[PDB]
Structure formats: structure tokens, C-alpha cells
Design a protein around this ligand. Structure first.
Ligand SMILES: [Cl-]
Ligand SMILES: [Cl-]
Ligand SMILES: [Fe+3]
Ligand SMILES: [Mg+2]
Lengths: 197, 212
């Protein structure tokens, strides 16, 4: 009762799916290898970090990013699959934003990178919408009681990025310096950018 | 579909398996893991055989215990394989022959889907809306925690998309609708049993109605 079904090893199943389609001429030459390269090298949270650093140092761009995220991202050429309609959400001294896909995994791939395993976990998908404060605490991020937490559930085609607050101690940093502290988890919203001593 | 995939609000899970900024390792942790997404895109863009919506739904159609014990990328191997069989592109026999063993698929759909609603309302930022108190056995992009609940519009998209409940079943009558960022107070969704502030759900126009 309740037992798993018999299954061939997953690698064998996945490659069987490839070979069945490839052997019918349905998969162009180099196709999956091209996607692998896009997913590994192009889709990256370094892009979202570039956008945050620009916003932090350019009020005009900040305004654009917050009002028409698609247009702002397009300036950099970073629209793409799973990242065609972008909304950036602003953290403030009284608001912390956090993103999830409770139904599956949806993520702004081109600017955040493909989601990490933990983001797709049942634990995150079930819990962050109901107890985000405790989830973030457990993960290492304490959000004070004076701060409303707002969870965006990625249920349609909007693809989100968080614009975190800029920490003290970074005044006058270059865009490159600022980018370094905007991590993937800052863009998802579970982390706050950290400044070293 | 009120499946086990509709996890938001479920209680009893443990810690999220991450601490902030920890090493997540490479993008792909096994040499096959780029295949499900790549082959999904082959199906959508190259073959024209199915939509991304149909992929979301076929994963929802995994047998529930099977869903719960299957790693993420494997669910999409299963789902894309299933669609290829259902669409007549591949056979389960050839998949199992190539795999050298069993390759169970998602279960058949129990709904033909439904059309884009004929009667909907264009909402404005600041307006109060209720999520329609409806039950859809097939695909729907409405997590049950918001069914029947009231919130306020934060955004109306400037683009429109096919209605999931139709295109997720390969129907011809998905039309197009904008979606709305609907902000709900945490207490509206979970009463006293929440530690959050607000939750914003991105809801197709056809899931919404004016609040009373
Ligand atoms: Cl209560
Ligand atoms: Cl209506
Ligand atoms: Fe998702
Ligand atoms: Mg349910």
C-alpha cells in the first residue's frame, strides 16, 4: 500500500525520451546542448544584480525598473524565456518582499538564473506563503516586527525580481562593487545584501 | 485541479533545505537534468505539439503519491514524455524499450478543460475583487488558498495571455486575458494562523469578480 511504482533509473528514462525524439528527426542538431549552454552561462543572477546596482545609483533607472520592469530589463537585453513580462518589487524600511511559485517553480530565469533546488522544494512552496517570517528566520534572515512581509506567488506570466534596500556602508561604491553583494537570494527576496567589515 | 501540487498553506513540512547564500552547486546536478526543459521547448517551439500550460497540467496529473516522491526535474521528464505519448508522437513501448525498464506516465486527464469566460470585468488599480468561488477539475492557475477570498488590485498587466484552463488542455478557445496582481491580507487567507503581512497572487481576469 502506498508503494512507489517500479521505474527504470531516471537517467535512463531521460535519455530514452531524448533518443526517442532525436531518432525521429524531431530535435534539431545541437538543440539540447544549446539550451544547456543558455541555462548554464546566460541565464544568471549576475544580470539581476547588474540591474539592482544600476537602480541603486541611477534614480531615473530605478523609477523605470519599478514602473515598467520589462522596458528596463530590455535596455540591457535581458528579456528571455520565462522572463518576458517583468515586475520589480521594492523593499522599503517597512516592507520586505519575497517571491515563490507555490504551484511549481516559476522564476524570472534570465535575470535570476534557473531556480535553486530549495526554491522548488515542497517545504518552501508550502510554507513561505503562510509563515514567511519563520521561513526567512530559519534560512538566516531576521525580519523585524516593524516590517510587513509581502509574498508574491508566481501564478501567471509575471516574472518578479526583488529590488532590495541598499545597505549602509556602501556609499559611493561602484556599480561593480554593488553588484557583488546582490546575490541570487537577494533577488528572490530571502536574503538582504550584506556589507563586509 | 485540487491536486497535491497545490501546496501553499499545507502544514507539517520541515525546514527549507537552504541557508541564505549557501552554495547551491552547479545549475545541473546530473548530466540529464537539462533534458526536460530543453525537450519541453522542442515540443512547444519546434514541434508545436503542446503549450507550456499543458506541461504544467501534465505534471499536476502525476498520480499523487508519485508526484510526492519524485524529484523536480524528474517530474518534467515524466510530464514531457506523457505529452509526447498523448499527442501520438511517441509510444510508451518505445520509451520503455529505450529506457530498459518501466516508465510510468502521468494519469489521463479527467476534465476536457473549460473556455475563457465570456463575461469578465476590467478592473482598476485599487479596486476590491473576490476570487470566484468555483471548482475546476482541470488545469487552473488559482491556488486554493485564495478561492473565494477578497483582495485589492495592485496591477493590471499591459499584456494578455491565453486562459490556462483552456490552453492547458490544448483547447482552441483560450482567448486572451490580462492578469491582475491581487493583494490579500495574510489574515484573509489564513486567519490568525500566519506570521505574514500580505500575499500577492497573479490572477487571470476570468478568476475574478467585483467584491460584493
Ligand atoms: Cl483563525
Ligand atoms: Cl466579473
Ligand atoms: Fe512554477
Ligand atoms: Mg487543495
Amino acid at each position: 500500500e502506498n508503494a512507489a511504482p517500479a521505474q527504470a533509473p531516471v537517467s535512463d528514462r531521460a535519455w530514452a525520451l531524448f533518443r526517442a525524439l532525436d531518432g525521429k528527426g524531431l530535435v534539431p542538431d545541437g538543440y539540447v546542448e544549446g539550451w544547456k549552454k543558455t541555462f548554464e552561462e546566460d541565464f544568471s543572477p549576475r544580470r539581476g544584480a547588474e540591474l539592482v546596482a544600476r537602480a541603486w545609483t541611477d534614480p531615473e533607472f530605478r523609477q523605470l525598473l519599478l514602473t515598467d520592469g520589462t522596458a528596463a530589463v530590455a535596455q540591457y537585453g535581458y528579456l528571455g524565456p520565462q522572463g518576458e513580462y517583468i515586475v520589480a518589487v521594492e523593499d522599503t524600511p517597512t516592507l520586505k518582499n519575497v517571491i515563490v511559485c507555490s504551484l511549481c517553480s516559476c522564476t524570472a530565469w534570465p535575470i535570476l538564473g534557473l531556480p535553486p533546488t530549495w526554491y522548488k522544494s515542497f517545504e518552501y512552496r508550502a510554507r513561505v506563503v503562510r509563515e514567511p517570517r519563520k521561513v526567512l528566520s530559519e534560512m538566516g534572515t531576521e525580519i523585524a516586527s516593524d516590517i510587513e512581509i509581502r509574498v508574491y506567488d508566481t501564478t501567471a506570466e509575471t516574472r518578479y525580481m526583488v529590488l532590495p534596500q541598499r545597505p549602509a556602508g556602501t556609499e559611493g561604491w561602484s556599480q561593480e562593487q554593488l553588484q557583488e553583494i546582490v546575490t541570487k537570494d537577494c533577488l528572490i527576496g530571502v536574503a538582504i545584501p550584506q556589507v563586509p567589515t | 485541479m485540487d491536486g497535491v501540487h497545490d501546496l501553499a498553506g499545507v502544514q507539517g513540512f520541515g525546514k527549507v533545505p537552504h541557508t541564505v547564500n549557501a552554495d547551491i552547486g552547479p545549475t545541473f546536478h546530473a548530466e540529464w537534468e537539462h533534458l526536460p526543459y530543453s525537450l519541453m521547448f522542442a515540443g512547444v517551439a519546434e514541434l508545436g505539439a503542446f503549450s507550456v500550460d499543458e506541461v504544467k497540467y501534465v505534471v499536476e496529473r502525476m498520480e499523487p503519491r508519485h508526484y510526492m516522491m519524485t524529484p523536480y526535474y524528474e517530474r518534467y521528464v515524466i510530464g514531457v514524455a506523457t505529452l509526447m505519448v498523448e499527442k501520438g508522437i511517441l509510444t510508451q513501448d518505445e520509451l520503455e524499450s529505450l529506457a530498459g525498464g518501466p516508465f510510468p506516465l502521468s494519469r489521463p486527464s479527467e476534465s476536457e478543460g473549460r473556455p475563457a469566460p465570456v463575461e469578465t470585468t476590467t478592473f482598476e488599480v485599487g479596486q476590491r475583487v473576490r476570487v470566484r468561488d468555483e471548482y475546476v477539475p482541470g488545469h487552473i492557475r488559482m491556488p486554493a488558498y485564495c478561492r473565494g477570498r477578497v483582495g485589492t488590485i495592485s496591477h493590471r498587466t499591459t499584456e494578455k495571455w491565453p486562459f490556462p484552463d483552456a490552453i492547458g488542455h490544448g483547447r482552441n478557445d483560450a482567448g486572451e486575458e490580462p492578469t491582475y496582481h491581487v493583494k490579500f491580507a495574510a489574515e484573509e487567507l489564513f486567519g490568525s494562523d500566519t506570521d505574514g503581512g500580505s500575499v500577492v497572487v497573479d490572477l487571470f481576469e476570468g478568476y475574478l469578480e467585483p467584491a460584493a
